[PDB]
Amino acid sequence: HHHHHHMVGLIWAQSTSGVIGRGGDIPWRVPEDLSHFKRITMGHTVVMGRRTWDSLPASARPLPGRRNVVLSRQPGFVAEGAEVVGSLEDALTGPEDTWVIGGEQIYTLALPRAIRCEVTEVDVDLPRDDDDALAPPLDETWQGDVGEWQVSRSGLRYRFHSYYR
Numbered sequence: 001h002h003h004h005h006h007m008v009g010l011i012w013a014q015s016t017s018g019v020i021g022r023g024g025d026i027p028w029r030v031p032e033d034l035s036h037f038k039r040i041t042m043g044h045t046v047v048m049g050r051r052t053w054d055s056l057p058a059s060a061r062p063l064p065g066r067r068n069v070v071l072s073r074q075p076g077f078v079a080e081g082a083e084v085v086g087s088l089e090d091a092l093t094g095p096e097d098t099w100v101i102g103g104e105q106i107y108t109l110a111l112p113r114a115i116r117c118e119v120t121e122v123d124v125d126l127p128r129d130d131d132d133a134l135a136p137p138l139d140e141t142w143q144g145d146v147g148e149w150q151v152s153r154s155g156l157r158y159r160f161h162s163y164y165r
């Protein structure tokens with residue numbers, strides 16, 4: 001069951017070790033995760049920190065088919081094709097389904113408001129570094145399921161987790 005009144009969800013991909021980002025990029029190749037990310041977010045509102053906006057390739061700025069919302073404390077930051085807001089509150093003003101798409105700073109900020117998480121886990125040798133962007137923890141309030149391990153065209157093992165509360 002999926003709730004549809006001010007539903008806030010978080011969607012991320014992470015290594016088993018908990019890394020979501022390094023040096024400004026997502027440090028692995030899983031094309032099936034791009035497919036999975038689009039499948040969930042397409043047509044919905046997407047919320048993202050300024051760093052994540054910067055990390056997008058110009059060919060996906062803004063993310064097509066989604067209402068793009070960008071969080072920045074910088075007064076007057078321009079995000080062409082996206083709405084820029086200065087608080088988590090202004091970001092989540094819409095009642096339509098809204099997916100927080102990263103990065104770590106925004107996951108940590110939106111997590112008390114979220115009632116769904118869609119997590120890709122990637123089995124990649126990626127020992128965590130203090131400068132990485134890291135995955136948010138999931139406490140015991142979450143119910144959910146975990147898919148089977150699959151193998152990517154890139155050779156990496158991955159699997160999908162889906163949680164809710």
Ligand SMILES: NC(=O)c1ccc[n+]([C@@H]2O[C@H](COP(=O)([O-])OP(=O)(O)OC[C@H]3O[C@@H](n4cnc5c(N)ncnc54)[C@H](OP(=O)(O)O)[C@@H]3O)[C@@H](O)[C@H]2O)c1
Nearest residue numbers: 012013021024025049050051052072073102103104105106
């Ligand atoms: N694996 C995944 O699923 C995934 C998904 C998305 C991103 N990533 C990776 O994660 C990294 C980015 O994550 P990050 O945590 O470093 O950055 P981030 O969360 O994407 O963005 C950080 C920025 O958000 C703004 N911000 C934060 N809190 C705010 C608040 N309360 N009010 C207003 N604005 C606020 C600030 O922008 P200003 O400095 O402009 O003020 C801050 O610098 C990148 O390497 C990216 O590739 C991975």
Ligand SMILES: CCc1nc(N)nc(N)c1OCCCOc1ccccc1CCC(=O)O
Nearest residue numbers: 011012013033034037038060063101102120
């Ligand atoms: C696809 C990576 C990704 N995967 C999951 N499961 N959750 C995210 N929040 C996420 O990050 C979304 C922001 C970065 O997205 C991209 C990064 C590099 C190339 C293309 C895209 C997205 C393009 C699109 O979705 O249309």
